[PDB]
Amino acid sequence: SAAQKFVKQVIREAFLQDASDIHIEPRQNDVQVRLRIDGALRPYSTLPKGALNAVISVVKIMGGLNIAEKRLPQDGRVRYREGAIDVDLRLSTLPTVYGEKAVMRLLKKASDIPEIEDLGFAPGVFERFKEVISKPYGIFLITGPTGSGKSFTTFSILKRIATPDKNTQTIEDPVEYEIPGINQTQVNPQAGLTFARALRAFLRQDPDIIMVGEIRDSETAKIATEAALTGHLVIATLHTNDAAQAITRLDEMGVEPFNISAALIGVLSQRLVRRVCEHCKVEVKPDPETLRRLGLSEAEIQGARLYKGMGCERCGGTGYKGRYAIHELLVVDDEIRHAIVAGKSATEIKEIARRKGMKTLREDGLYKALQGITTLEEVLARTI
Amino acid sequence: SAAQKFVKQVIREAFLQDASDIHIEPRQNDVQVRLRIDGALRPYSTLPKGALNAVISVVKIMGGLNIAEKRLPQDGRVRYREGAIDVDLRLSTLPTVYGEKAVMRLLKKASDIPEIEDLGFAPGVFERFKEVISKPYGIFLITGPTGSGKSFTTFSILKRIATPDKNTQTIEDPVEYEIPGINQTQVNPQAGLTFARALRAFLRQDPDIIMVGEIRDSETAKIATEAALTGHLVIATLHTNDAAQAITRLDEMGVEPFNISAALIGVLSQRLVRRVCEHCKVEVKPDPETLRRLGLSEAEIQGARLYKGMGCERCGGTGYKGRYAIHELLVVDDEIRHAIVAGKSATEIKEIARRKGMKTLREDGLYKALQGITTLEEVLART
């Protein structure tokens, strides 16, 4: 049985205890159970070793995975609730040396959407954000966490452009982000309504603006891109953490390249870094070669200086004052179009867009790192 | 067919007697079934060559392997259970011209892992070790050959930091030691599940702590950097000639060196030397040129002594009881963050580190030899 009582109580308590995730953890004689309370995976409970495989089936059922299988890694998405307990969860299981692990990340439950300007965009990208959002066509991707970051911010563009004067529609399995002005297609793969098939249908639904809640597979990426091809703004949750990465990804997904070429217009990021404790910030020399190699706009290479917190009344034993959303706007002009199709790297696409002082997850990130807002280290982790 | 117990027992004994693995090894007429105790493949039992196949058929039974496919090796973690074992076995069966063969690596458990100091560090070298693993986030690199003790460190550090407050996950193609506080897994890069793909799995699985058994592709350093600095803490392992070289190599491997310039907290390099058995140690004098090259004074050279692991039953006939490593430790600061991004050579980085008080891998080796812990011959033979 339990097994199941751990999934259920770990979930209830994960939410009730202010955790960021749920774990039932395959172990040597047992299965450890942990909750990410205040960011830390504190012990919760224990199951006997085989109970582990029981808990991975439970979570697979919840989000469209192969329930029966007890040996292979899988992931999908769960909308879970129980009374006071109500969270969008990231579903994933993983075979371990003691059977598969059962994990449910707690994603921000819908929580609506932030705007682009709300991010506090550096003028390097903000003035250009206005440029890009004024152009309601092509694929316009968003980076970061499931729900939480990406699907949370994916519709950020839409909040700026899905105005009374534009047709917006989104495909989700099931719908979480009930956002204006969007038609939120509810994906039901068991009947053939995959995001992919729904996207082809989005064209049938005459989009000005097209959305994907999560581009989770090749048929979906292929079709999302087809959906952009006829001149519509395919805004989408791209399973990435870097704007330039979001751009190249369609090739990686096996998207038929004729669609890729006709589709991409730009990418939005706000990926978070640990924010340096500004008030006890430790001078750290950035390495300007680190910054150069990163491809930053010279002043932001040379006059740049790092900090790290030493620990503080404003960061605790982390060295960082909570978090900082790093800004980015990539813009796909004709030369970038060629770069995408050619399979150019995130560094190359970002480095190009970055010039003229344009902020990227790397340039804004590192730029702020270099003021003492974050640490170049963290930024680099954001933009690897 | 006594073979069923036979398989389970060679396995049982390999684990019981502290082997790293099990070998049901064929011969022209019989089978040399062995246990790798202290590194020696001790003869558990022979089998008639005909019984070889009965025995290998059994390892395929126990492992759920395609027992009918005599033309192929088959492999996986086998839940063999008898006496000493609840060790999982990396069963690998294989056809031979004598019939078939099978090997079972002992997937030691959490409870079997060594400490981070047990690795054999000099106090100041260890101080650096400790500082690096003690951070709440960031990455600790380990480097050297399998048999470098890299495993001891790899498993040990997580034993040390994989507490009940940090979900830990580990990426180990051979598994070897199934760490505490951890949801450790298999890799098999042939399947697409490379060591980097496994890091991505860990992140999907919300680890607070992530570890890489082998950096192969650049993603095993780059994702490791991500996790290390996306709020998680990371341990990761390479195969180099020094600590300094870990940095050199990651740049060379395609880790755009602003990665690691970023997460790298520090680097450990090591090599195991066989550890002289107390029932084998023989006093011999080490060579003055080597000793001098490794920093020993003339007065010390004349008083210098090595101990040779001559051989006894208490050490599996290897002459050495257990293993001990040669060490080098680097802590990352601004001098190093530059060197990392700059793509500096192992020599260039090592010299910076020596300025900072780091003993080199080879110098430290000598000093272990001089205590009779190992033999200088063994040190040199291992670096």
Next chain:
Amino acid sequence: SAAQKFVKQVIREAFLQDASDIHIEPRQNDVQVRLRIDGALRPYSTLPKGALNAVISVVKIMGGLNIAEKRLPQDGRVRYREGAIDVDLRLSTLPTVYGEKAVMRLLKKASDIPEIEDLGFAPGVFERFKEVISKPYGIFLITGPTGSGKSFTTFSILKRIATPDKNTQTIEDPVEYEIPGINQTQVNPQAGLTFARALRAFLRQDPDIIMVGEIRDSETAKIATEAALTGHLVIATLHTNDAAQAITRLDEMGVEPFNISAALIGVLSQRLVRRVCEHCKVEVKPDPETLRRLGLSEAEIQGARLYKGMGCERCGGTGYKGRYAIHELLVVDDEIRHAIVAGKSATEIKEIARRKGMKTLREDGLYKALQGITTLEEVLARTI
């Protein structure tokens, strides 16, 4: 039967006269039977075409193949013996327009394996090879085109460590050098047991030694080397004419140069220049042009007791008796490991290597010939 005797007698003499193999094949009027005595297929006897099928049926019986299926290709193995003869035979057959062809190569046993110091070494080569066998872990890059002595070399290095107390695991197809106490594997790519799959198992066999008769492909190269990197000894076959080129190939076969700079012990580039038969040893000073092609110095020319392989009888008229592993030894020292980690080419490695004493195949083979071992015609055909 005559067929049994045709097979018995050719094998009988194949062993006794030192053939590396037996070749029975149809020609336009008969079937020629040849022995690779001292490196070339001297004529042994012939048999009358219908006899091909009778004789070949017998060799198929020996190797376990389908007796007379002269319409489709096959392979297998036999444990052959007569007394004083004991050799396994390598069997494969080919349907031809004249009936079906076969080859029975002689599968040399452990008793036929040289020592390490015998692997083409000059006094200075062993001193340096001492340093090679003394390296902590890694791979021995034995290299050259088919027809060379690579299988002896792989076994010589292996034999040193090929014991009942070591996990000696070899790839042969079928097994030749049976050493009781070690595991010797026949690959089966038809089943899926490619050399690489076998090696994957070998790595999974927790080998002390991965000895590979043929680096068939990239995975085969890597996996054997993965053991080399992961604390084991690896002994294997490459196809180059420079030791520097062997390394270049190891790097170019997909074996990571960064890992190779750790995993590589040494390179044994060698070619079996055929040795001039003692009974045909006619002083020749080759063309004379080959004398200059191989680089002889005046001193070496004056001492050039170069002989022509006229054959006479010792290998029939094929020219030579005994073979010599011309040996270009590259000790993979820290400067070579550096050249490797740096991604250096065969030229660049060769320049460092020769600077460090890596006498080339051209120079060494040449010297062997000067010493009365071989003919420079063979050295030229055995170098680059």
Next chain:
Amino acid sequence: SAAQKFVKQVIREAFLQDASDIHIEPRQNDVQVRLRIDGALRPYSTLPKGALNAVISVVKIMGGLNIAEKRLPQDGRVRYREGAIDVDLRLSTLPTVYGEKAVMRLLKKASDIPEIEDLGFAPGVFERFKEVISKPYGIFLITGPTGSGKSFTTFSILKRIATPDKNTQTIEDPVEYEIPGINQTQVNPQAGLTFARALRAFLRQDPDIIMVGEIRDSETAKIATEAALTGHLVIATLHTNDAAQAITRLDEMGVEPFNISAALIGVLSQRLVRRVCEHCKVEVKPDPETLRRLGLSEAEIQGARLYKGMGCERCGGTGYKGRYAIHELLVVDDEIRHAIVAGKSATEIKEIARRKGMKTLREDGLYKALQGITTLEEVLARTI
């Protein structure tokens, strides 16, 4: 279906006349059965158009093709070696205004094997031919016409290297190009023994020398090349007309470029361009732009005149004095091996050899044109 009566009157005459082809022509009321002889047709027999269709099925039958499908084109070939009938028939059908043309192309009698020097290669080619065979391993690939190029010349290579002391075998269907000292295989695709299968034995038998009469399977291309990887001298026929083409084609066959690149040591070609009278020569401009576009040595681009006959009692009647053997040797070095993987063009891969004085068909040809023996037009006719 007789139909066949008219066709058979023709296979009799067509084979007797050394015709290039047998033409069952889909005409308006009837079917012509024509003979292409000495480069051009003459008619011989006539079927009704109803019989056209009968023959379309007949030739599809001979190749094991879909004989019911009288509307769509199909091909293959058959061993028509019935005494007086001694030429393979190339099976092809092709739909026209009155049904498919049914074709029985005469895959010209081997005309056996030249002793390669016999080709009359320019000295900078022949002496290099000799240089290539001095290193007897890997692939020595040859192109050119059936009966005057394909296996004609690859077997010429065997004739010059595959002595009785080498384990040498070929794959043909049927065997025609015969060499004493060598095994020659009949492929039996009917049994399932395709050229790939024939090669599987060639690889498995560990020969000194391997010959493929026609690289006619994915697996054939692959296996021949896999054998070459280990140093077997895989001489092979690639049924095309240019060495430069032959250098990269196996990749098209699905053959791993690792094995293709590692394998090659040289590739030849030959042509029959028509000669001119010389005595009654017509000056034709050796246009240097033609020659430059061709990539010829300046020795030929500028150092030249072409000569055409007048058609002309010393030619004829096309203005040319019979067939003129033109040759090529693309010697393969390390840079060429890099080019194989790259997939360099025929002009480029050919140009490299040409600039070394190694006259290619394009140079040896055009050279012979530019020397006034033939015209650039006839050579270009073949050096396309």
